[PDB]
Amino acid sequence: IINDNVSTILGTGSVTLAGNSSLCPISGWAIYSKDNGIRIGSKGDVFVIREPFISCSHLECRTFFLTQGALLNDKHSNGTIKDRSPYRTLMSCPVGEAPSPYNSRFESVAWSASACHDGISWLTIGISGPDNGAVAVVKYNGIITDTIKSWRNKILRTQESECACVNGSCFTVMTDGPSDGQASYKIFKIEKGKVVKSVEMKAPNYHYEECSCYPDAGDIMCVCRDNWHGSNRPWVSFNQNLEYQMGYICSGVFGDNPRPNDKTGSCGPVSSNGANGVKGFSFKYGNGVWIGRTKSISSRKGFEMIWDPNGWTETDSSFSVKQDIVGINEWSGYSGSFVQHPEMTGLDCMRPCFWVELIRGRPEENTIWTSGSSISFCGVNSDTVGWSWPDGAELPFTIDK
Amino acid sequence: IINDNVSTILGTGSVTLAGNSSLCPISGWAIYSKDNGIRIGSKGDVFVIREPFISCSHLECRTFFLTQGALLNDKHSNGTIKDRSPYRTLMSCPVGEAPSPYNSRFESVAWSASACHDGISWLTIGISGPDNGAVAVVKYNGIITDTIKSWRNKILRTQESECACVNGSCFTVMTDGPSDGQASYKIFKIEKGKVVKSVEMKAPNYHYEECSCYPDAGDIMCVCRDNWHGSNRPWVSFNQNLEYQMGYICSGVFGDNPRPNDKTGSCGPVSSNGANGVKGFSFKYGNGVWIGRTKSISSRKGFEMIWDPNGWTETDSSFSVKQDIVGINEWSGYSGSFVQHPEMTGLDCMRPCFWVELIRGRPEENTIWTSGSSISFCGVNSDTVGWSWPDGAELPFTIDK
Amino acid sequence: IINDNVSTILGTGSVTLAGNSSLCPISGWAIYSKDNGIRIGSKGDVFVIREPFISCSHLECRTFFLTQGALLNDKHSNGTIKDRSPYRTLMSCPVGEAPSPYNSRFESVAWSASACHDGISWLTIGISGPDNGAVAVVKYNGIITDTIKSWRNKILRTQESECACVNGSCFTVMTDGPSDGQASYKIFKIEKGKVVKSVEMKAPNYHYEECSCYPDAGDIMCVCRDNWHGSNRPWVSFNQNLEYQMGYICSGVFGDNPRPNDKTGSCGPVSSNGANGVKGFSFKYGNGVWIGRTKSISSRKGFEMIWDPNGWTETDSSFSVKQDIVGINEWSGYSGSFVQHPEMTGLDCMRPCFWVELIRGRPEENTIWTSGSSISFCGVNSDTVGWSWPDGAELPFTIDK
Amino acid sequence: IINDNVSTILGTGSVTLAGNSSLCPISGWAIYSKDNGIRIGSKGDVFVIREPFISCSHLECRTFFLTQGALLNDKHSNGTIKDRSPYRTLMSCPVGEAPSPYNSRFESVAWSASACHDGISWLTIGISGPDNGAVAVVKYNGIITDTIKSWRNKILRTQESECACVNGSCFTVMTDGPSDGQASYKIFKIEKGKVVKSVEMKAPNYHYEECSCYPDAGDIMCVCRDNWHGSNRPWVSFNQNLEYQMGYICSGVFGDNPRPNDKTGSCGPVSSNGANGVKGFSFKYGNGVWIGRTKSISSRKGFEMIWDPNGWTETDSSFSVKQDIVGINEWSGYSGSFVQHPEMTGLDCMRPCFWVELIRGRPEENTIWTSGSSISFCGVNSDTVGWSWPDGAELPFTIDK
Ligand SMILES: *[C@@H]1O[C@H](CO)[C@@H](O[C@@H]2O[C@H](CO)[C@@H](O)[C@H](O)[C@H]2NC(C)=O)[C@H](O)[C@H]1NC(C)=O
Ligand SMILES: *[C@@H]1O[C@H](CO)[C@@H](O[C@@H]2O[C@H](CO)[C@@H](O)[C@H](O)[C@H]2NC(C)=O)[C@H](O)[C@H]1NC(C)=O
Ligand SMILES: *[C@@H]1O[C@H](CO)[C@@H](O)[C@H](O)[C@H]1NC(C)=O
Ligand SMILES: *[C@@H]1O[C@H](CO)[C@@H](O)[C@H](O)[C@H]1NC(C)=O
Ligand SMILES: *[C@@H]1O[C@H](CO)[C@@H](O)[C@H](O)[C@H]1NC(C)=O
Ligand SMILES: *[C@@H]1O[C@H](CO)[C@@H](O)[C@H](O)[C@H]1NC(C)=O
Ligand SMILES: *[C@@H]1O[C@H](CO)[C@@H](O)[C@H](O)[C@H]1NC(C)=O
Ligand SMILES: *[C@@H]1O[C@H](CO)[C@@H](O)[C@H](O)[C@H]1NC(C)=O
Ligand SMILES: *[C@@H]1O[C@H](CO)[C@@H](O)[C@H](O)[C@H]1NC(C)=O
Ligand SMILES: *[C@@H]1O[C@H](CO)[C@@H](O)[C@H](O)[C@H]1NC(C)=O
Ligand SMILES: *[C@@H]1O[C@H](CO)[C@@H](O)[C@H](O)[C@H]1NC(C)=O
Ligand SMILES: *[C@@H]1O[C@H](CO)[C@@H](O)[C@H](O)[C@H]1NC(C)=O
Ligand SMILES: *[C@@H]1O[C@H](CO)[C@@H](O)[C@H](O)[C@H]1NC(C)=O
Ligand SMILES: *[C@@H]1O[C@H](CO)[C@@H](O)[C@H](O)[C@H]1NC(C)=O
Ligand SMILES: [Ca+2]
Ligand SMILES: [Ca+2]
Ligand SMILES: [Ca+2]
Ligand SMILES: [Ca+2]
Ligand SMILES: [Ca+2]
Ligand SMILES: [Ca+2]
Ligand SMILES: [Ca+2]
Ligand SMILES: [Ca+2]
């Protein structure tokens, strides 16, 4: 006993997250964090970032993000550089803190990324390399533990949000192939950073990108982005053996952006305004769905949470509850799910939470640069309120003039 | 034993603050900290802050503050934004350090706030949302544990100083209603971040805002701000069961600002110059009172500690001891109590301390911005000295010209 | 056993430094650190500092320093402000790191200071208040534990270097009275931050300021600064009961600055060029002395270590070894002793070390500001080499033009 | 048991790295880190650095570097100062983070350096002093533990990469003498920072500089830089008793820079383009070699890994595998080996890794300054990809115009 407990004592945790509880009952969303990254970066030394997803360990939640190694208001924030560049790096800082070289931990070299914590150590996945042969480097506790190479030679890419950990194994989804047609999609089961299983989904006429995956009662649910021909979001669920089912959110409250106005939906891809999209998320609650989506159907502007009690399986456009998150005239962007496990909260259920990226700059504003700040909310079964928590930076910046 | 001790070992504390000792005997105030926030922020990257209250754990004391996510000498420090904005965040740094995005921990999204440490974990309370439906989000150890929604739909607001913890439960006061007339006041008892009890005080003709609450011998004493019709400060005391008594400081040494010149007082609200006020504090010592107050009766200038041996219950304007803190020609501002518990100090009594916010900028100076720096003092039973420890920034700044 | 060891485990050390070993045999000085504070602060956000003394805990050595809450190249570094100001604060950072608001721990409000570590916790002493009634605030583990008020009402002042800890008690020297005549000098013995004993030395015709004190074989030796009428340095030694002896370094290698050229010395104050001085240090080795001193006899320029095998008791001007530290044409300044205890090094003897402050700016240069950077060396019994490790900042700065 | 385990518990490790395993089988190199130091330092406060070698403890890998105490875009980055200056300091930060005074730990005063971790504590070696009498100061756990003085009085210099630790002893190589002719070379065995053994190699007609040393199966292999008359790299291997063998890499894939075009090689120094060179590395795998080298044979541009299955012993210019690291039109520079021990990775073999310094500025660009950023890769037995990961800073900077 002494010997095993002293080893245990000697930031690595002891027990894996079980991932065996279901989502907590909730009525609304309480605001969890806001970093004011771009407002602070007007003067401070703050990274130009994209995709600030959140993921929690046993002691804290962190914001992971991609950066081009350039600071706001610096000449290198110039958007002349391709998103999939050799300078792109995945890094992480505490939630609610501005992403700075003075507070950000380096995680990986990556222009596409995922990260999660199995209760013992951080798993990070960072994809770099050329478009025709990218490699995901898989680190566990900061040590490289595996690699995954592109298998269709067409931009290997992954979640841009947290992977999902259940009972010592973490799960993620990756896409290889075009972003405007049929592609190839793989589910990976990874233990201690070592890929122990993977399956290629037989998903003809489906399209999966930038999956928001969360654990629920031992299984994993991913709600993703159909960039090909879908204005509703696709989903794939699977158990710990990668036995999977697939579909699209049936609700007529369409979840992607761009999208048509709400009307009768489909449990397959809604082709109207289906091309393009945005990373997003949803929480399945029985046959209902908590949908997070932009307010504008044409631009990435505004954000709302919508409870549709039958949205997972019924095609009508009716719902019960709308909670405002970002006002319709304010910029939003990518959004993603993250969870807080009972091991961290002491609750008996999986707490659902989500983050919203607030994009400022190009293409929609007269700057040389593009960046995002971050807000995030957690679902609670107590009183909540809608509002607008936008980015609030006054553009353009000094570097733009 | 072994298994319970290794669990304990694996920054969370083991034992709650008991809160069962009375205030230490003191004769004066020894200076504890000074951050020079605005002087440093002239060049460094330092937040524009307000309300820098102090609160201590078992290992350190921290300065909590509200910020608009803007830095000194940056264009976003422009005071064009409502105080209750969606950009306002509660954050904290070590005492005496300038509040910077590089040293400040994010706590909550809030334009009104409270925080305290029960001996195990930090409790934070941050109110955000619209004026007609604000929600206090209650986090314990950084995890959302409860919410409290506005019940009069008129700017739910709280202490702007530390809550008080006794025997595992922490206590705070909140106000809902107008700031210029009768409002509604509630006492909350919170355990592990979960509201276990609350009482609405029956306070006709009282006004409570920005309560400075401290524990004393198992009960909680709050000295607050009457913004309606009081130039002396109101007080409310209660036990751990929320049985409460109320009053106003009887001393003719009036504690609010603005206020009349010292004359015979009242144990009810002194209506002369009673409208408006400043957050402040006092320590009840038997039937005497340690009053911390501005020196000017009309502006937020100067600061002094005054020992009135009968001020709690007698209306005369006589006192025995005055210790200077900030000179009469220097800017002061909000002031608040904080305590150091026997668990932290090794003393057998509750140490009283206080912080003073030193406001620079609008409305009283020719800048585009308003901020504060921080000084703080602890009561001791040894030799002390009066002086003036002002902010010392040379205004206006570059951003103002 | 379990219960006491778990408490022990739960950064406070367990055992006090014994302080019972003598100084290690040494032949020379190996360079230990250099911070390049002013060179870095040309662009970075670095404090304007003075008196960067060093002191070591069980895990690290730290540089403590006094700052006016102003940064290099900022308008507030303007030397218009008195040294004994209400803005002066004692802070500390890791040795060899530039002193920045982003890496500096706040210690105390002080314009005169001392600090040391008894093996369990940091003791800090910071003097603030008016010239006619200054108070030293004594903190132990960051908690205020005592105060010491001025007893001659003439600028209470202390070491500006580390106090000396032996067997759980730490010792320091303080001066009250004029800096140009007979003053009053007190030795303090402090346990857990509580002054347990103090003696006023009967030192007619002596003058003690800015004492460099170190422990040696259970006793404490202080080598100080005679600002009245001495160009050699005064010393006072005492045991743990404050039974003391006094004298001046007899060597004709005069240790103060300004001073006359080396000639036959005195074991009393050498009046020639005796007025004024600089903080300095020496190590007594039997009847010999390691003297650290400026190279110029008129300015604070250059620095050398000189081994005089009979300098403690003989008045001749002969010595054996000179090791160059700072070249004669480069600026130096204050210098101080610090020690590394066997508990930290694992040696069986007290390691002697010293730091040199390198002053740049007013009065000797055409700037608006005065600051210092830091070098430091430790004595070793292995091969060493003399050189010049000057400050190396190119003055004046942008703020000066 | 209890007392020894609590002692152990009370960042120092318990067990030394054994160093008894051989190199892991690998097929390629997965990218491990990229710091974007110069791009970030365009605006942020980042050191001008050289030689950013990497070395790992039991908990993390750190980038050590030499700096002149000057920041990018600051006037003190002016290259007017000798490389071997008194301002040069060895410092370290986490891998992949920009080297800033706000995140960099001070290690030593040094213009030549080495560092490694024996599993318990950090060993650092920093050489300072004059060219005719430089002293390496050897610190262990930050405490000075030994000195090594120049023995030929001609620029004592060392690895500029990590030393190699086996079974509690760490090993390094030092050179004293000219950089364009026969010099003197010494192997040092150091335990707890104390030099326990050293041998002067009998190396007529060899030249050793800037050795990249790694442990392998109980012995140490160093691949170094022949600055005298060699365009292939020299190697020296030795056991823990300092019994050594020597040679040059036989492969016609020449590893130094400058060098001739690939042709039939030699197991002695290849005199063609042999003068000068660059710090580099190679991994011996049986009779084959993993060679890391620039792409250009005349300038420090580009970088590639080349697997030559017989390159260690055969002089042919044939190889089997080339993996691109930095493109031919991009600036590279020094390169060095580092290792990850089984104690850190949980593997059963020594993981090989390497870092590349990417030099920007003089002599090859029109700036006043010279600095480097950092990339690094680890060998893996899984899928990899070649690419170009260059520095990516747009030169010149503001300070240059
Ligand atoms: C998920 O599995 C965990 C681990 O088995 C369950 O937690 C344990 O449940 C048992 C039985 O009720 C308790 O006695 C233990 O104290 C629990 N903790 C541990 C660490 O084993 C958990 O209840 C399961 N969650 C469900 C079923 O929702
Ligand atoms: C100073 O005192 C300490 C503490 O008593 C001495 O260290 C102990 O010495 C004894 C007797 O030799 C050893 O058995 C212990 O292991 C030592 N350590 C402790 C923690 O007690 C130390 O040797 C003394 N120094 C001298 C005499 O120079
Ligand atoms: C200590 O180790 C024992 C087995 O040796 C295990 O049963 C126990 O849970 C451990 N205690 C902890 C991890 O607190
Ligand atoms: C504890 O002490 C024992 C006895 O000295 C030793 O064998 C062991 O390695 C130590 N550590 C642990 C983790 O048991
Ligand atoms: C951004 O890049 C373009 C060329 O791609 C250049 O013309 C422009 O000046 C750059 N802007 C800044 C602010 O550096
Ligand atoms: C879950 O974890 C347990 C305990 O480590 C393990 O034995 C089991 O195989 C895992 N799998 C499932 C499907 O529960
Ligand atoms: C408060 O309670 C604790 C725990 O029971 C006790 O040790 C302590 O003495 C009490 N304090 C006072 C002042 O009675
Ligand atoms: C502050 O805001 C006012 C009102 O919008 C504007 O006119 C002014 O230019 C602003 N000042 C700065 C320095 O941004
Ligand atoms: C543990 O405590 C015992 C007494 O209870 C003491 O003798 C022993 O030295 C302690 N061990 C430590 C501090 O490592
Ligand atoms: C260890 O566990 C015992 C038994 O639960 C408990 O009484 C004690 O307070 C714990 N802590 C210590 C430091 O002994
Ligand atoms: C310094 O202060 C003087 C007045 O005391 C003033 O004239 C001068 O402009 C100041 N310099 C700077 C750089 O602020
Ligand atoms: C030294 O420390 C011991 C042990 O704590 C204590 O008993 C003793 O009084 C101290 N004094 C001297 C003079 O050694
Ligand atoms: C190295 O030595 C350790 C300790 O004896 C042993 O456990 C390990 O297996 C050895 N490694 C190899 C590769 O033989
Ligand atoms: C760099 O040094 C040169 C030579 O001393 C000097 O002429 C030049 O002005 C310097 N440049 C800068 C930017 O300081
Ligand atoms: Ca779409
Ligand atoms: Ca519906
Ligand atoms: Ca009032
Ligand atoms: Ca009275
Ligand atoms: Ca003198
Ligand atoms: Ca002599
Ligand atoms: Ca060569
Ligand atoms: Ca070959």
Residue numbers in the entry:
A (entry chain A), B (entry chain B), C (entry chain A), D (entry chain B): 65 to 74, 79 to 469
According to the publication:
Influenza virus neuraminidase (NA) is an important target for protective antibodies and therapeutic drugs against influenza viruses. NA cleaves off host sialic acids, aiding the release of newly formed virions from infected cells. NA is a mushroom-shaped type II homotetrameric protein. The polypeptide chain of the NA monomeric head folds into six, topologically identical, four-stranded, antiparallel β-sheets which are arranged like the blades of a propeller.
N1/19 hybrid means loops 01 and 23 of N1/2019 grafted to mSN1 (H5N1/2021) scaffold. Similarly, 16 dissimilar residues within Loops 01 and 23 of N1/19 were transferred to mS N1 scaffold to form N1/19 hybrid. The N1/09 hybrid showed an 8°C improvement in its melting temperature Tm to 64.4°C compared to the N1/09 protein (56.4°C), while the Tm of the N1/19 hybrid (72.4°C) surpassed the H5N1 mSN1 scaffold donor (68.7°C). The CD6 epitope was lost on seasonal H1N1 viruses isolated after 2015 (unpublished observation) so CD6 bound to cells infected with N1/09 but not N1/19 virus, but CD6 bound to the N1/19 hybrid protein strongly, suggesting that CD6’s binding to the N1/19 hybrid depended on the scaffold residues donated by the msN1 protein, and that the N1/19 hybrid protein had formed a compact tetramer compatible with the N1/19 hybrid’s higher Tm of 72.4°C. Similarly, NmAb-03, displaying specific binding to N1/19 NA on infected cells, exclusively bound to the N1/19 hybrid protein. To assess whether loop grafting influenced the local or overall structure of the NA, we determined high resolution crystal structures of mSN1, the N1/09 hybrid, and the N1/19 hybrid. Overlay analysis revealed that N1/09 hybrid and N1/19 hybrid were nearly identical in structure to mSN1, with overall RMSDs of <0.25 Å across equivalent Cα atoms upon overlay. In contrast, the N1/09 and N1/19 hybrids show no noticeable differences between the protomer cavities, all of which closely resemble the wider msN1(ii) conformation, apart from minor, local widening of the rim induced by the substitution of Y344 with an asparagine residue (shown as light-green sticks). Additionally, we observed that the Y344N substitution in the N1/09 and N1/19 hybrids slightly widened the enzymatic cavity compared to msN1. The mSN1 and the N1/19 hybrid both induced strong inhibitory antibodies to themselves, but the sera to mSN1 failed to cross-inhibit the enzyme activity of N1/19-like virus and the N1/19 hybrid protein did not generate a cross-inhibitory NAI antibody response to mSN1.
